[PDB]
Amino acid sequence: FGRFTERAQKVLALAQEEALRLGHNNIGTEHILLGLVREGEGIAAKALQALGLGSEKIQKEVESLIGRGQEMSQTIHYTPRAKKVIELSMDEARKLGHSYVGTEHILLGLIREGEGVAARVLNNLGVSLNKARQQVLQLLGSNETGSSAAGTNSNANTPTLDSLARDLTAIAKEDSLDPVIGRSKEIQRVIEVLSRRTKNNPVLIGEPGVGKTAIAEGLAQQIINNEVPEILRDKRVMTLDMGTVVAGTKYRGEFEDRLKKVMDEIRQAGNIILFIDALHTLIGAGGAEGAIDASNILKPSLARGELQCIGATTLDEYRKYIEKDAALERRFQPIQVDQPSVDESIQILQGLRDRYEAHHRVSITDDAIEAAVKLSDRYISDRFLPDKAIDLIDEAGSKVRLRSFTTPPNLKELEQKLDEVRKEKDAAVQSQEFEKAASLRDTEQRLREQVEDTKKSWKEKQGQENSEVTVDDIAMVVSSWTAQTETDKLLNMENILHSRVIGQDEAVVAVAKAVRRARAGLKDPKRPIGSFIFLGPTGVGKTELARALAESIFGDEESMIRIDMSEYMEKHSTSRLVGSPPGYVGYDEGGQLTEKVRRKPYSVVLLDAIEKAHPDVFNILLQVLEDGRLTDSKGRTVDFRNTILIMTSNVGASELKRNKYVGFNVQDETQNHKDMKDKVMGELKRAFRPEFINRIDEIIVFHSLEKKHLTEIVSLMSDQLTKRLKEQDLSIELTDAAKAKVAEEGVDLEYGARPLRRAIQKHVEDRLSEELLRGNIHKGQHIVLDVEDGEFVVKTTA
Amino acid sequence: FGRFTERAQKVLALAQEEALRLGHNNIGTEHILLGLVREGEGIAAKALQALGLGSEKIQKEVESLIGRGQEMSQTIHYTPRAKKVIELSMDEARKLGHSYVGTEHILLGLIREGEGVAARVLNNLGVSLNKARQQVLQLLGSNETGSSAAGTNSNANTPTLDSLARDLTAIAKEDSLDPVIGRSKEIQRVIEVLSRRTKNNPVLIGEPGVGKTAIAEGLAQQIINNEVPEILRDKRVMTLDMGTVVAGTKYRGEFEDRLKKVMDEIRQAGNIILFIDALHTLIGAGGAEGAIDASNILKPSLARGELQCIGATTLDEYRKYIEKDAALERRFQPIQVDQPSVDESIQILQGLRDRYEAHHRVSITDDAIEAAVKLSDRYISDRFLPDKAIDLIDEAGSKVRLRSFTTPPNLKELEQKLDEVRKEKDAAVQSQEFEKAASLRDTEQRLREQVEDTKKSWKEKQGQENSEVTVDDIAMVVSSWTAQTETDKLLNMENILHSRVIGQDEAVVAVAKAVRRARAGLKDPKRPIGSFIFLGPTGVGKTELARALAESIFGDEESMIRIDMSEYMEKHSTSRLVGSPPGYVGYDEGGQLTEKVRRKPYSVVLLDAIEKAHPDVFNILLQVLEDGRLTDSKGRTVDFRNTILIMTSNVGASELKRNKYVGFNVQDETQNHKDMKDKVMGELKRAFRPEFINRIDEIIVFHSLEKKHLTEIVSLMSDQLTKRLKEQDLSIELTDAAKAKVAEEGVDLEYGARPLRRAIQKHVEDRLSEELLRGNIHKGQHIVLDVEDGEFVVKTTA
């Protein structure tokens, strides 16, 4: 373990002394035994001496098992028996508590390791081996700790405080506990619920979902010193926990009987505080289920303040307790409970980082935590504000030690060598090849040991590397799952967003900067990270930007919703049954929009075609854009904070399907640019409400494509082609010359961004494939699609 | 078995020695016994010798039984008894482990086979039969390997490992384990999630599915040597086995107690790795009911990092774990899981090739293996990417062994002869006919031995067949459920689609080549391997091609969906229906379309008439045409990846239908071909959208009711007549002359292939049946439908 006590380690080192002193190549088990008795006293040492085995008795036998010499101490490590004895003490101390191993455990371990040289020493000297293991044990007392013992107090406390349970106050008198976190005003407010008497029962309302029990340790501390009543001092805090009741009982009826007994013993009352987790479940009122009706005993108890108690209830549970009354509502009284906000997250991270330095890393870093947390709160966005965080910290809190030790020192080849040896050796010895095996053995185990020496030479790489949990590290994780390599995504957002967006330096930079503004807490987070309307036709860069955002902002693309407004416009699905029959605004709110975004909160919510949806739909969209929430689906709250709203329209489309011209002039092109960035955002206003648009940060125009943008759609569709065919069959590349010939056809004055899919289809997909059908190209070769003399020719370069 | 160890086989063979050495012309059981003891000191031999039965006692008895001395042996074979001793020992070696058979088992088997002469030999020589079986048994020698016995001891290690369960590392240190081929890239990403302790726990979320456990065996192996962190210092990996916990307890309370016990012993913490299979089920979160609520012990265990564990959860299950939190989520953490990609598939196949040698019908070929995978991957697809594969290997991996013994040179006839003999013989011995029976036995047993000789002359039919699995072999089998005879289907696709489909050679070749283009992986197959528009009037070639495509691509015709989009109505029936219109488009998206294509993943989806059949449908289909997917049915994704989308049309029909027949045109014909290949596809564009059409592979025109196309429609319908009556037993053939006379009546510029059914009905069905009524033809004679001189005539030729 290397986290043993002295005492163990000492009998063991005494073993080596006898190794050479008695002449043993390998420090035998006989020496570990000698080690115990030669340290004189120590529970092992003493133990052997109890049975009558002094150093005298032992050594006569020991020298009679291996005499002198062998003073060479040939590769002095232990004998394998003796090595087992060391392993044995570790477990012989685990079972007997001890994480740090002593003398005793080794003598106990010897007995265990009973065919060993030691073992035979004792069984030869007339002392039964088990008589020895006994002897160590009966001196391995292992007195109380984490508690104290010296007397007996109390009579009436006996029946009550016994039952049920740990007694939180007790565990907080002598620490065997941790703060852990709060919820500080809750503790004040608990004493608000506890310095009264009619409604003397605290009732914590909130998600549970923060580790309610952390708050509880709060009361303990504060009820003692010094905010507590004048004659309703001498308070005791007694915990009532379900787990103790159910175990070995296995019945609700019996559980009720035991609980009844507990309420009776609480007769030390008028000074007692009871902790009741999930108070509704016991009350039995509300919902189809009652989840037991403890209420018969529990309710009058709650009202009197004999069961002056702390109720841990939730959002719904409080309804289902106050509904009874007036002793579950002439007892109850609620208090507003906290759960971590963004800053709180950071603090939690640090607090339990440090204890996983048992796990030799984690340790570090403030900044790293900040990455886990800060990046998470707004983006990914896959759990809760601190929960998200810790995973990120920890992936990376491992990640680097793995890439560190990606081999031995690169001496991974060594193991490979040693294999080949063993084989040669083995097979050679099985045939013989006598001395032709000789050298093979020697080469084998020589090598083997060398390998192992250098396998811990990247323990130098441990002392070099093995704590990294840094900004970038964490940040890599935050992008990895879906504050450096997420904020490098943020800072370099424009670069990332352009690479899929079909030209449109205009579109990209507008979205990029707006998301980047929010994404480091500069714009507005109680709104989407960016609200936008993206106008244009199909295949212009709209969708492509939505995607590129999912990737950049959250780390991976899968955090992207994409909702058709056409399914529930109540103006294009009204009675056309698009999707399913549900009455359409009800379909969107009551189900689809709210459920989906509630599932993925990070989601780039892409609400397609808000162009001609019913004006009521826009009121909902406006609420998403402003509030960063919608409340629908019978009172569920759906998080649009961390969303990136991108609402598309194809009313810009007309203008955004003209290219960046190739029209009547070449000065029509530089008049198409300005035309697309102006005409679109006003066809937007004509298509739907300004009030809606008033909650939208920037109106992104996705300019139709003139190369620059043409040769970038051709290179997106053709690149989507060349990659989807590599998994099953051929390697395709289109030369730049061939991407050019398609882009000329992606021109139209009136269809500047749509025609491209078909023309990649015909000119790439169809073209390689009709060339496999001829036998010009094939599966599994590299297909360069080239221009021959102004006609495509599929060439091979494999 | 035919795979026995020496010791057995030798004692047995020594019987044959005594057979002739004493003359016993059938090698008796007495000789098997002699066989044991004359083989000296095998466990059988040795055994008898312990009880006192040396060779001396045995042969002395033996020679006093059958004894001397007709040194030959009758067909030198055994007694039936002695043959039984061999069969018995084999089983007496199965019992005692032993895959093969050893000496002991033969003596043990003798005792068992106790009416044998040996048994009586031993019971004559003063040693009880059971004293002999005793001795062999208690010298238990059998086949061995998987050594792990040499004596072991530990103290605390005892409580954990007892319960519950196998140790993955252990089975991989004696290597009774196998890799197994993963799912390799997953394992690195786990050790990041595992060398943690702030979120200590990996939790694998994904399809389970080819064996989740392959990833698990991964960890074990990497955690030993050496790329493993020092974060993960001195780790052991222990696997959860749910089955042992539930067994022998038969109660939830007891089950909980055992799990609790395990969590306690995990006190070896910070040095232990726990593998928890199906981790959600124990947490018991979500649903109407839980799933088992081990959670009380398990949740804090997960949080502490004592149960630093690897969770194997499923698609929904992770939701139901973060649903608890933040210790079932602040410990837990999800990871992206692998299920083998197409290349990985191939490798698996081969990996288990060598054990298919046990059935001897594959090993080999690679080329076939690839087929198993690839052909299946793209074309149905009713299993996962490697499962599909392996099944095909073995499918073919038997197929040829069946052709082996169905047709060798057919010494099946031999056996047939031998039959006739026995009968004759038997009945002859019974008739008497006695010496006339004599020779009949002799002819019988002669035959019997010959029979048996020529069936193992078809061990030459084994050395010929008994391991291959060839290209075609796999491919044909791939066609049987669902490279050669699936890629011959691909290469010869035009030929195959024409052989069932009409004179629309234009259409056939266009579709054939377009599917064959995609289906060989050189044209976009993310979306259907062919999207199409099929123009023509109904019954022309359109439907028929949809069928022929299924047949060619998948090897079965009945993998063809078929939806009419025009049937979806009530899509404007507001108050018109009554007061609400609940249904039809909602049925199509919400259930029918998505479920059906998801059911048969790849299948010719034949979307009938979308000329104006809800303009919204064309958009919905467009998403299929582009992506290969639709998302409907409340979040199901339907893969139309290598479906063949065929969207039908009969709006071009009018021109497609037009003539090419003589008797009335000689210049409209040569204006109907050229007219159809342009004009048809433009009546299409008004009936769809260009946006739709741009994501279509090709726009197919079925030049129809030509001269030519007719007599092929007539030959499909009339051939369906001649075939549909054979089940009810009538043989019909139409001569080409009679199919021609009907074909004249479906052509002009106007009509369709509609009147062809009616006229086939009249001239074949109705007429032949009225010809049974007139008595020229009957039921079950061959009916030739001929033309006499221009007047129809039904002739008979059977």
Short mmCIF file of C-alpha atoms in Angstrom, two decimals, chain A residues 637-784:
data_model
loop_
_atom_site.label_atom_id
_atom_site.label_comp_id
_atom_site.label_asym_id
_atom_site.label_seq_id
_atom_site.Cartn_x
_atom_site.Cartn_y
_atom_site.Cartn_z
CA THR A 637 -40.30 25.43 -17.12
CA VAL A 638 -38.22 24.99 -20.25
CA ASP A 639 -34.78 26.58 -20.37
CA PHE A 640 -34.13 28.81 -23.35
CA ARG A 641 -31.31 30.61 -21.50
CA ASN A 642 -28.67 28.33 -22.88
CA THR A 643 -30.42 27.91 -26.21
CA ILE A 644 -29.36 29.77 -29.31
CA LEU A 645 -32.55 30.80 -31.04
CA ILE A 646 -32.33 30.81 -34.76
CA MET A 647 -35.65 31.24 -36.42
CA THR A 648 -35.62 30.88 -40.17
CA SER A 649 -37.65 32.48 -42.89
CA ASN A 650 -37.64 32.22 -46.64
CA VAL A 651 -39.09 35.63 -47.29
CA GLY A 652 -35.52 36.94 -47.47
CA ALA A 653 -35.02 33.98 -49.82
CA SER A 654 -36.06 35.79 -53.02
CA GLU A 655 -33.18 38.25 -52.67
CA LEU A 656 -31.10 35.53 -51.14
CA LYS A 657 -31.49 33.55 -54.32
CA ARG A 658 -29.85 35.82 -56.82
CA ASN A 659 -26.27 34.99 -55.88
CA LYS A 660 -24.14 37.92 -54.98
CA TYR A 661 -25.14 38.39 -58.64
CA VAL A 662 -23.82 37.34 -62.00
CA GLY A 663 -26.71 39.34 -63.47
CA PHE A 664 -27.05 42.19 -65.92
CA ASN A 665 -23.83 43.82 -64.74
CA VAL A 666 -20.71 42.77 -62.88
CA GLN A 667 -21.55 45.81 -60.75
CA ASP A 668 -24.85 44.07 -60.03
CA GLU A 669 -22.85 41.72 -57.83
CA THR A 670 -21.59 44.44 -55.58
CA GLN A 671 -25.23 45.59 -55.59
CA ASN A 672 -26.50 42.16 -54.67
CA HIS A 673 -24.34 42.12 -51.58
CA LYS A 674 -25.86 45.34 -50.18
CA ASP A 675 -29.27 44.18 -51.53
CA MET A 676 -29.24 41.01 -49.59
CA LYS A 677 -28.18 42.68 -46.41
CA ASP A 678 -31.08 45.19 -46.68
CA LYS A 679 -34.13 43.76 -48.51
CA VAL A 680 -34.17 40.68 -46.36
CA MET A 681 -34.49 42.20 -42.88
CA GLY A 682 -37.56 44.21 -44.14
CA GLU A 683 -39.32 41.23 -45.76
CA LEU A 684 -38.78 39.81 -42.29
CA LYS A 685 -40.79 42.71 -40.80
CA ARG A 686 -43.44 42.17 -43.50
CA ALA A 687 -43.63 38.47 -42.77
CA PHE A 688 -44.13 38.74 -39.01
CA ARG A 689 -44.45 41.09 -36.00
CA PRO A 690 -41.84 43.73 -35.01
CA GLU A 691 -42.55 43.02 -31.27
CA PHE A 692 -41.19 39.53 -31.83
CA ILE A 693 -38.18 40.92 -33.72
CA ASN A 694 -37.77 43.47 -30.87
CA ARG A 695 -36.60 40.64 -28.63
CA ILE A 696 -34.17 39.42 -31.34
CA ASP A 697 -30.56 40.55 -31.17
CA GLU A 698 -29.53 40.50 -34.79
CA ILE A 699 -31.20 39.65 -38.04
CA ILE A 700 -28.88 37.47 -39.97
CA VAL A 701 -29.20 37.51 -43.68
CA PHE A 702 -27.86 34.52 -45.47
CA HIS A 703 -26.65 35.92 -48.72
CA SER A 704 -27.08 33.91 -51.84
CA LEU A 705 -24.10 32.58 -53.28
CA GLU A 706 -21.59 33.86 -55.75
CA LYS A 707 -18.26 31.99 -55.67
CA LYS A 708 -16.60 32.66 -52.73
CA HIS A 709 -19.94 31.27 -51.54
CA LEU A 710 -20.77 28.97 -54.52
CA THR A 711 -17.46 27.13 -54.44
CA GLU A 712 -18.02 26.82 -50.65
CA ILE A 713 -21.44 25.08 -51.00
CA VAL A 714 -20.02 22.91 -53.76
CA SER A 715 -17.21 22.14 -51.35
CA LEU A 716 -19.64 21.39 -48.51
CA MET A 717 -21.92 19.06 -50.48
CA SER A 718 -18.98 17.46 -52.28
CA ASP A 719 -17.15 17.07 -48.91
CA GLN A 720 -20.26 15.46 -47.40
CA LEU A 721 -20.22 13.12 -50.39
CA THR A 722 -16.51 12.21 -50.18
CA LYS A 723 -16.79 11.33 -46.44
CA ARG A 724 -20.06 9.33 -46.44
CA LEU A 725 -18.64 6.95 -49.03
CA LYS A 726 -15.32 6.24 -47.24
CA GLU A 727 -17.02 4.21 -44.45
CA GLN A 728 -18.36 1.74 -47.03
CA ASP A 729 -16.30 1.83 -50.24
CA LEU A 730 -14.13 4.44 -52.05
CA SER A 731 -12.09 7.53 -51.34
CA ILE A 732 -13.23 10.56 -53.34
CA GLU A 733 -11.61 13.92 -53.79
CA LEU A 734 -12.78 16.62 -56.11
CA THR A 735 -10.03 18.84 -57.50
CA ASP A 736 -10.53 22.62 -57.12
CA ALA A 737 -10.99 22.72 -60.93
CA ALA A 738 -13.98 20.39 -60.61
CA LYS A 739 -15.54 22.28 -57.65
CA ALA A 740 -15.34 25.35 -59.92
CA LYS A 741 -17.33 23.77 -62.78
CA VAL A 742 -20.24 22.97 -60.41
CA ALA A 743 -20.19 26.43 -58.79
CA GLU A 744 -20.90 28.13 -62.17
CA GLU A 745 -24.22 26.27 -62.15
CA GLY A 746 -24.89 27.22 -58.54
CA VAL A 747 -25.28 30.67 -60.07
CA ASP A 748 -28.70 31.75 -60.70
CA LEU A 749 -30.14 35.22 -60.72
CA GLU A 750 -33.28 33.75 -59.11
CA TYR A 751 -32.04 30.48 -57.54
CA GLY A 752 -28.67 31.46 -56.17
CA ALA A 753 -28.38 28.90 -53.39
CA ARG A 754 -30.78 25.98 -53.90
CA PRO A 755 -29.72 24.29 -57.28
CA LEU A 756 -26.45 23.05 -55.82
CA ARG A 757 -27.62 19.83 -54.13
CA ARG A 758 -28.85 18.39 -57.48
CA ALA A 759 -25.71 19.57 -59.30
CA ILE A 760 -23.28 17.99 -56.81
CA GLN A 761 -25.53 14.95 -57.00
CA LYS A 762 -25.25 14.76 -60.78
CA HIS A 763 -21.63 15.87 -61.11
CA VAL A 764 -19.97 14.14 -58.16
CA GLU A 765 -22.08 11.36 -56.72
CA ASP A 766 -23.69 10.22 -59.98
CA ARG A 767 -20.44 10.85 -61.83
CA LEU A 768 -18.16 8.62 -59.71
CA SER A 769 -20.83 6.04 -59.56
CA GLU A 770 -21.49 5.95 -63.32
CA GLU A 771 -17.73 5.55 -63.64
CA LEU A 772 -17.77 2.60 -61.28
CA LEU A 773 -20.57 1.21 -63.48
CA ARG A 774 -18.31 1.64 -66.52
CA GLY A 775 -15.20 0.48 -64.61
CA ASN A 776 -13.26 3.78 -64.89
CA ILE A 777 -13.18 4.07 -61.08
CA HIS A 778 -14.13 1.57 -58.39
CA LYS A 779 -14.82 0.92 -54.73
CA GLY A 780 -11.83 1.40 -52.40
CA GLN A 781 -9.67 3.48 -54.74
CA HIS A 782 -8.99 7.18 -54.64
CA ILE A 783 -11.14 8.93 -57.14
CA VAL A 784 -9.97 12.26 -58.20
#
